[PDB]
């Protein structure tokens, strides 16, 4: 009931702008959890709980996306403390961050990249159905459940409620930010999400990001360092259309020729992860 009696705390999993995440175990059912600490001092994204109380946007957003669809990590609980917020999140076991998976394996085979991409497409589509906008889609914010071959979207610390009017604030990662942001500091949610999705696909199949500097983004020319299929190249260059309204919708991305005949997660695991 207190807090540190209900969860067997463990070793640091990582830390950065999101805060400090620790491996953990819920005492009782021995459920594997992740305990995320973030201090009020450095919280930039604040939100309002359904019942008034002021709270880290992440709590607001995870609450809006909690249920049976396991494409986004589940918030199991949360606590306020005098100077910080603590979040209890699910923890697949074994697990691996997409960034580390790609770092140690290089460019992914298209079949595997297809399976993964599809899964993050289903998970962003879910977030949007719940009025949630992630704003920081990238390899680091995606976990892999190595047993099931299921991806989980994580880290909603830069998200926002989904809206159809313009955004004038951006907290997410720069090299993942669309030409609209760089040039005008204005963007719309869906089309910006699609841009970052295009960066993600490229990263998956090439092993690295397509653009390093602002001028590279504004130019939007995509050079391919590795061998990549023609359909995949066309989907990538589409998501990375300079004009936002030129970018495909989620339905359009999922109906794209490259996106056909996706493996189910468990097949993915047996052929590519086991």
Ligand X SMILES: Cc1cc(C2=NC(=O)N=C(c3ccccc3)C2)ccc1O
Nearer to ligand X, 104 or 261 (CB): 104
Is 19 one of the annotated binding-site residues? Answer: yes
Q: How far is the CB of 19 from ligand X (least distance, A)?
A: 7
Give me the phi and psi of 138, to 5 degrees please: -175, 165
**Angle, helices 189-206/230-239, rounded to nearest 10 degrees:** 150
**Residues 244/180, Cβ–Cβ less than 8 Å:** yes
Strands 75-81 and 20-26: what pairing?
Answer: unpaired
Give the tokens for residue 237. 């260059």
Nearer to ligand X, 14 or 257 (CB): 14
**Run of H or E including 17:** none
Q: Is 14 in the site for ligand X (CB under 6 A)?
A: yes
136 is catalytic: yes
Q: How far is the CB of 32 from ligand X (least distance, A)?
A: 8
Residues 149-178 that bind ligand X (CB under 6 A): 154-155
Q: How far is the CB of 254 from ligand X (least distance, A)?
A: 26
Other Cβ atoms less than 10 A from the Cβ of 41: the count is 7
Please state the separation of Cα 253 from the chain's center in Å.
Answer: 17
Is 20 one of the annotated binding-site residues? Answer: yes
Which among 16-24, 120-128, 181-189, 266-274 is the span making contact with ligand X, rule CB under 6 A?
16-24
Residues 42-81 that bind ligand X (CB under 6 A): 73
Q: How far is the CB of 270 from ligand X (least distance, A)?
A: 23
Q: Given the residues 83, 136, 208, 246, select the one marked as catalytic.
A: 136
Which among 10-18, 127-135, 232-240, 261-269 is the span making contact with ligand X, rule CB under 6 A?
10-18
Q: Coil, strand or helix: which one is 28?
A: coil
Q: Is 140 in the site for ligand X (CB under 6 A)?
A: yes
Strands of the chain, DSSP E: 7-15, 20-26, 31-39, 46-48, 54-56, 75-81, 84-90, 95-97, 132-133, 142-145, 150-153, 160-161
Q: Is 91 in the site for ligand X (CB under 6 A)?
A: yes
* Residues within the interface to ligand X (CB under 6 A): 13-14, 16, 18, 21, 34, 36, 73, 89-91, 95, 140, 143, 154-155
């Amino acid at each position: 009931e207190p807090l540190e009696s209900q969860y067997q705390v463990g070793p640091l999993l990582g830390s950065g702008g999101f805060g400090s995440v620790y491996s953990g175990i819920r005492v009782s059912d021995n459920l594997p959890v992740a305990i995320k600490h973030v201090e009020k001092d450095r919280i930039s994204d604040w939100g309002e709980l359904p019942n008034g109380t002021r709270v880290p946007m992440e709590v607001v957003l995870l609450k809006k996306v909690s249920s049976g669809f396991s494409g986004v990590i589940r918030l199991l609980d949360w606590f306020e403390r005098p100077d910080s917020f603590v979040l209890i999140l699910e923890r697949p076991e074994p697990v691996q961050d997409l960034f580390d998976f790609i770092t140690e394996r290089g460019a992914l085979q298209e079949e595997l990249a297809r399976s993964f991409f599809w899964q993050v497409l289903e998970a962003v589509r879910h977030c949007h159905n719940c009025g949630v906008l992630h704003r920081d889609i990238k390899d680091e914010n995606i976990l892999i459940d190595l047993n099931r071959g299921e991806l989980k979207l994580i880290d909603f610390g830069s998200g926002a409620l989904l809206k159809d009017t313009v955004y004038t604030d951006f907290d997410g990662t720069r090299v993942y930010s669309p030409p609209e942001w760089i040039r005008y500091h204005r963007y719309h949610g869906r089309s910006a999400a699609v841009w970052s999705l295009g960066i993600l696909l490229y990263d998956m199949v090439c092993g690295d990001i397509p653009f390093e500097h602002d001028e590279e983004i504004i130019r939007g020319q995509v050079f391919f360092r590795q061998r990549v299929s023609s359909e995949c190249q066309h989907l990538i260059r589409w998501c990375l259309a300079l004009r936002p309204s030129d970018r495909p919708t989620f339905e359009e991305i999922q109906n794209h020729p490259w996106m056909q005949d996706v493996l189910l997660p468990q097949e993915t695991a047996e052929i590519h992860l086991h």
